[PDB]
From a paper:
In the end, we solved a structure for the wild-type σ1R from Xenopus laevis (xlσ1R), which shares 67% sequence identity and 89% sequence homology with human σ1R (hσ1R), to 3.20 Å, and termed it xlσ1Rclosed-endo. The xlσ1Rclosed-endo structure was solved in the space group P21 with each asymmetric unit containing 12 protomers, which deviate little from each other with all-atom RMSDs of only ~0.2 Å between the protomers. Superposition of individual protomers of xlσ1Rclosed-endo and hσ1RPD144418 excluding α1 yielded an all-Cα RMSD of 0.35 Å, indicating a high degree of structural conservation among σ1Rs from different species. However, xlσ1Rclosed-endo failed to achieve our initial goal as it was captured in a closed conformation similarly to hσ1RPD144418. Surprisingly, though no known ligand was added during purification or crystallization of xlσ1R, a clear electron density within the ligand-binding pocket indicates that xlσ1Rclosed-endo was bound by an unknown molecule, which may have an endogenous origin. Unfortunately, the current resolution of xlσ1Rclosed-endo (3.20 Å) provides only limited details about the shape of the electron density, making it impossible to reveal readily the molecular identity of this unknown molecule, and therefore the electron density was not modeled in xlσ1Rclosed-endo. In each asymmetric unit of xlσ1Rclosed-endo there are four homotrimers of xlσ1R, which are organized in a diamond shape with the cupin-fold domains packing against each other, whereas the transmembrane helices (α1s) mediate crystal contacts between adjacent asymmetric units. In such a packing mode, each trimer has one protomer whose cupin-fold domain is tightly buried by two adjacent cupin-fold domains.
Residue numbers in the entry:
A (entry chain A), B (entry chain E), C (entry chain C): 3 to 217
Write the structure that this text describes.
C-alpha cells in the first residue's frame, strides 16, 4: 500500500482544501453584492450601452474606490468558452469576487459552464436565451432582466448580435478560469488572448492586494 | 525485434477485434429496427413533442418489454458534441443498438460526427438542416421526415430553437462515445454531464444484461 | 547545464528557424498577388457562385499555368476550426502562399484564428459578419466586398447559410494548420477530414515542387 500514499494524499488534500476554501467563502466579508450591481446595471439598461458602461464604471469608482481598475488597465478581451464567443471588460477581480462588462457583437451560444461561483448578469442591451438543465424549453431575457447562474448549475446560453450586460461573480474565481480558457486552449489557440486574460486578472489581483496593504 | 512487438500486437488485436465485432453485427439478432422506430415516430409527428414522447415511450414499453428504462432511470442529459449542444433522453442502449429522444431548445449546429453506427432521426418538431460532405448546398427537413446518417458518413447538422426528434442507432455503439463526449472534455468541462451520460448508458446496459439472464 | 540542454537547443533552433524563415519570406518572389485574387473574384461576384468558381479557376489556370491543381485532385473538404464549420476547395498552396474557395452551407461562426499569415477573402455570395478585437460592434460584408485578416489580428467571424468566397493567404502557411485542425482533433474527431486536408496540402506542395523542377 506504499503507492497508495500519493492517492491518499491527493484525496486528503482535496478534502482539506475544499473545507478551507468553502469555509472561507461562506465566512468571508465581501466588497460587492449581486443586488448592488443589479440595481446599478438596471438603472442604465438602455439602447446606448457604451454610455451605460461609462456611467457604471464612474459609479463603481465613486462608491468603491481602490477596487476598480484604472482606465489604463482596461481592455476588451475576447472570451471563447463552451462553444460561444464574447468579450469582457474586467473592472474588478479578486480570488473570491469579480465584476465585469460582458457581451457579444455576434450571434453565439453554447454551454454556460459548471463552476464554483455564483454569477449574476443584468442585461444592458440585446437578448439572452437561457435553457435550464433537464427541461425541453428555454426562456428569453431582455434588457433590465437579471439571470442568476448559481453554483453547480449548467445551462445553455445564447446571445444575439448586440448583447451586452454587467456581470458580478462570487465564489472561487481561479476555478472559473479553467472553463473560461478551455476553448482558447483547444479550439481557437489564441495564445495572445490567453495572455491578455491572465494579464488583466493579475492586474486586478495586484490592485486588490495593493488596496489591502494601505489598510 | 522486441521494440516491434507492441506494433504487431496492436495491429493484430485491431484486426481480430474488427473481424469479431463485424461478424457479431452480421450474426446478432436485433431488438429494434430503423423502420420500426421511424414508423413509431411518424405515427405521432402531428402532435406536441412532449405528448409524442409520452405516447412513444408507452408504445415502446408495450411492444418491447424489459428493454426500455424505467421512469426512475430517465433524465434529460445535456449533449455537447461537434460544436453543437442539445439534450437526450435515453430509452434503450446496448453494445449494438440505442434508442433515445434527442433535440435542442436553442439554435445550434456543428459536426455530425463520423463513427461506426447508422443513425436514423425522425423529426417530431422544429427544423433540421443537413449539409452532406462534398456538396455546396444544404437541405432542411421538417416534422415527419427521417434523416439517415449512414456509417462512415460525415455531415454538418443544424437545429432551430425548438427541435425534437426520435433517434435510433445501430452499429458499434462504444465507438461513438469518443465523439459524443469530446466537447464535454475540452470545451464545456461539464464532468457532471459526463457522469450522467455514463450513468444512463450503464443503466441501459445493466437492464439489457438483466433481461438476457432471465431468458 | 544538462537539464537545460533541451531548452537551450529549442531556443537556438527557434531563433535560427525564425531568422531563416523571415529572410526567406523577405527574399522570395511570390506567385500570386492580393489585388490580383481580389480583382478576379470581384469580377465574377455577380454570378452564381458555382459559375464564379468555374470561371475563376479557368482564369487562374490561364494566367498561372502549372500552379493550380488539376480537377482530378480537387475536392471539397470540411473545415472545423475556431468553433465554426465550413468547407474548402484548395486550388493552390505552398509553404508561403495559398489560394482556395471557402464557404459554408450552414449558419456558423467562431474565432478567426490568430496566425502568421495575411488572408484576403472576397465574398462571392452570402453575408460575412466580422467583429474586430477591442471593439463592441461588428460589420457585415456582402458579395463583392473583401475582408483583410492581417497578421497577428484576431476577429470573430460569422457566416450565413449560403456564404461562399475566394481566399488568398500569404505568410508561413504551416503556422495556420495548427489552427485549422484544432476542432478536428479535439471536437469533431473527423480524422478522415484530417487525412483529406493533409492529402490536398501534400498534393499542392508536390505540384509546386514539380513545377520548380522543370524550371
Ligand atoms: C438569443 C436569441 C433569441 C432569438 C429570439 C427568437 C424569437 C423567439 O424564438 C422563440 O423562443 C422560444 C424560447 O426561447 C423557443 O422555444 C422557440 O423555439 C422560438 O421560436
Ligand atoms: C453573417 C450573418 C449576418 C446576419 C445579419 C442579421 C441582421 C443584421 O443584424 C445586425 O447586424 C449588425 C452588424 O454587426 C449588428 O451590429 C447588429 O447587432 C445586428 O442586429
Ligand atoms: C435549421 C434552421 C434553418 C432556418 C430556415 C431558414 C430559411 C431557409 O433558408 C434557406 O435554406 C436553404 C437550404 O437550407 C439554404 O441553402 C439557403 O441559403 C437559405 O436561405
Ligand atoms: Au475596456
Ligand atoms: Au469598458
Ligand atoms: Au427523460
Ligand atoms: Au423522455
Ligand atoms: Au473542389
Ligand atoms: Au472547386
Amino acid at each position: 500500500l506504499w503507492l497508495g500514499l500519493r492517492a491518499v494524499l491527493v484525496v486528503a488534500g482535496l478534502a482539506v482544501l475544499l473545507q478551507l476554501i468553502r469555509g472561507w467563502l461562506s465566512s468571508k466579508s465581501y466588497v460587492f453584492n449581486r443586488e448592488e450591481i443589479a440595481r446599478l446595471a438596471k438603472e442604465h439598461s438602455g439602447l446606448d450601452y457604451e454610455v451605460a458602461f461609462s456611467k457604471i464604471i464612474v459609479e463603481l469608482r465613486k462608491k468603491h474606490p481602490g477596487h476598480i481598475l484604472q482606465d489604463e488597465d482596461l481592455q476588451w478581451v475576447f472570451v471563447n468558452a463552451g462553444g460561444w464567443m464574447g468579450s469582457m471588460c474586467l473592472l474588478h477581480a479578486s480570488l473570491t469576487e469579480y465584476v465585469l462588462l460582458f457581451g457579444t457583437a455576434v450571434d453565439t451560444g453554447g454551454h454556460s459552464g459548471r463552476y464554483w461561483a455564483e454569477i449574476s448578469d443584468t442585461i444592458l442591451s440585446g437578448t439572452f436565451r437561457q435553457w435550464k438543465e433537464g427541461t425541453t424549453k428555454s426562456e428569453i431575457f431582455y434588457p433590465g432582466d437579471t439571470i442568476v447562474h448559481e453554483v453547480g448549475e449548467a445551462t445553455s446560453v445564447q446571445w444575439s448580435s448586440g448583447t451586452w450586460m454587467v456581470e458580478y461573480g462570487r465564489g472561487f474565481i481561479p476555478s472559473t478560469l479553467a472553463f473560461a480558457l478551455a476553448d482558447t486552449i483547444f479550439s481557437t489557440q489564441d495564445f495572445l488572448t490567453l495572455f491578455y486574460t491572465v494579464k488583466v486578472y493579475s492586474k486586478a489581483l495586484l490592485l486588490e492586494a495593493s488596496t489591502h496593504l494601505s489598510q
